[PDB]
A and B are shown apart, each in its own frame.
Chain A
Amino acid sequence: XXXXXXXXXXXXXXXXXXXXXXXXXXXXXXXXXXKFVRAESIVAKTLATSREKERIKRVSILEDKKAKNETQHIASGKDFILKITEGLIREKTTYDGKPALLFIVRVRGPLAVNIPNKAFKILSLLRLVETNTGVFVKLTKNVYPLLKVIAPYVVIGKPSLSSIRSLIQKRGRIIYKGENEAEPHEIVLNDNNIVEEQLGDHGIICVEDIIHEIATMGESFSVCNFFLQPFKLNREVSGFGSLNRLRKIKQREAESRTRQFSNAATAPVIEVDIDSLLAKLN
């Protein structure tokens, strides 16, 4: 029974040391040496900035023409929604003038791009930095012009309420004010009385109802955006090493199939089934 206390202290000590040294090495050395950088990436990223900034410029032009309704010279008057499902079918449906639920998924962005400030502003107002963060959002017509801008960095789609249920009942943090803290702390979804404590005004109790009224959006959905404000997803592949590098290559081929980059400013919104996707990422 001595092995219990001994290895229990050892694993906690070595795990804290490993996490602290991993926190104190990664941002330290990559700014310490910081590199003998390269001569190629400095130019390829410059071309990638030219492309991405120009497509966001063309997006801003065409959306100002649609929004001010000074429209005489555009390609397409209405926007469109593309649907990638399974030699892979892509269904196109015209845009809906109706608010809806979406579960956006912050993807790792394309290869070597320095991203501008207009896209960074939209992503920062949507808390999508530090990728593998899919977050819930509202489809309207005024929130929609952001979706053309974030589309090369996120993926869009309709999730299922069973999958949304399993997301919320398995994952989720709450920034919380508690008994005695310095109070940057986040608790996972356990106490329904903590829920009704901060949400007794809106009358929101019993996180099953938070799932329900994220599904509903009839009374309050952005209150759930204030309360369940943080989100985290896992990295899908174990990564390095032979058995997982093949998996990385196959899934990069899958992502290169499923994501299409438009750069046309009449870019259709691309929806993928999040339901099979959360068999992977949750």
Chain B
Amino acid sequence: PKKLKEMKXXXXXXXXXXXXXXXXXXXXXXXXXXXXXXXXXXXXXXXXXXXXXXXXXXXXXXXXXXXXXXXXXXXXXXXXXSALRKVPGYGESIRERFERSLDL
């Protein structure tokens, strides 16, 4: 059994270690719904570093919060970026992940 534990200690590393990817073979699946991330090319559209436009989100802040959460979150996405010193700490991001998971 000491030799058995010696075997298992090496085999635990050797099993997770080895891997293989393969060559080009496409999966033409009609039911599969693969979509890229939205707002990936809209990062200048977010103010996000001391930019002007999100001050309009200051005017429509009550308009954003009055809306539904699906309409509130994208409207409250842009906000007044002050400086390096503060980042508000991401309440929305976990909900965004969970919403994306529900979309999948």
Do A and B contact each other directly (Cβ–Cβ < 8 Å)? yes
Binding site for B on A (CB under 8 A): 1, 3-5, 8, 188, 190-193, 206
| A112 smallest CB distance to B (angstroms) | 38
16 A/B residue pairs, CB under 8 Å, sorted by A: A1-B70, A3-B102, A4-B70, A4-B99, A4-B102, A8-B69, A188-B89, A190-B86, A190-B87, A190-B88, A191-B86, A191-B88, A192-B85, A192-B86, A193-B85, A206-B85
| B68 smallest CB distance to A (angstroms) | 7
Q: A193 near B68 (CB under 8 angstroms)?
A: no
| B93 smallest CB distance to A (angstroms) | 13
Main secondary structure on A side of the interface with B: helix
Q: A1-B70, A4-B70, A193-B85 are in contact. List 8 more A-B contacts (CB 8 A).
A: A4-B99, A4-B102, A8-B69, A190-B88, A191-B86, A191-B88, A192-B86, A206-B85
Chain B residues lying within 8 Å of A192, measured Cβ to Cβ, are: 85-86
Cross-interface CB contact of A5 among B69, B87, B88, B99, cutoff 8 Å:
B69
Binding site for A on B (CB under 8 A): 68-70, 85-89, 99, 102
A1-B71 Cα distance, complex, nearest whole Å: 12
A271-B70 Cα distance, complex, nearest whole Å: 51
Chain A residues lying within 8 Å of B85, measured Cβ to Cβ, are: 192-193, 206
| A8 closest partner in B (C-beta) | B69
| A4 smallest CB distance to B (angstroms) | 6
Chain B residues lying within 8 Å of A193, measured Cβ to Cβ, are: 85-86
Chain B residues lying within 8 Å of A4, measured Cβ to Cβ, are: 69-70, 99, 102
Chain B residues lying within 8 Å of A3, measured Cβ to Cβ, are: 102
Chain B residues lying within 8 Å of A191, measured Cβ to Cβ, are: 86, 88
Chain B residues lying within 8 Å of A1, measured Cβ to Cβ, are: 70
A8-B95 Cα distance, complex, nearest whole Å: 11
A240-B88 Cα distance, complex, nearest whole Å: 37
A192-B87 Cα distance, complex, nearest whole Å: 9
In the complex, the 6 A-B pairs of residues with the closest C-beta atoms, listed nearest first: A190-B89, A192-B85, A191-B86, A190-B88, A192-B86, A193-B86
Chain B residues lying within 8 Å of A188, measured Cβ to Cβ, are: 89
| A189 smallest CB distance to B (angstroms) | 8
| A188 closest partner in B (C-beta) | B89
A193-B69 Cα distance, complex, nearest whole Å: 29
A190-B86 Cα distance, complex, nearest whole Å: 7
Chain B residues lying within 8 Å of A5, measured Cβ to Cβ, are: 68-69
Chain B residues lying within 8 Å of A8, measured Cβ to Cβ, are: 69
| A98 smallest CB distance to B (angstroms) | 35
A4-B103 Cα distance, complex, nearest whole Å: 11
A37-B62 Cα distance, complex, nearest whole Å: 57
Chain A residues lying within 8 Å of B88, measured Cβ to Cβ, are: 190-191
A206-B83 Cα distance, complex, nearest whole Å: 13
| A161 smallest CB distance to B (angstroms) | 22
A5-B70 Cα distance, complex, nearest whole Å: 9
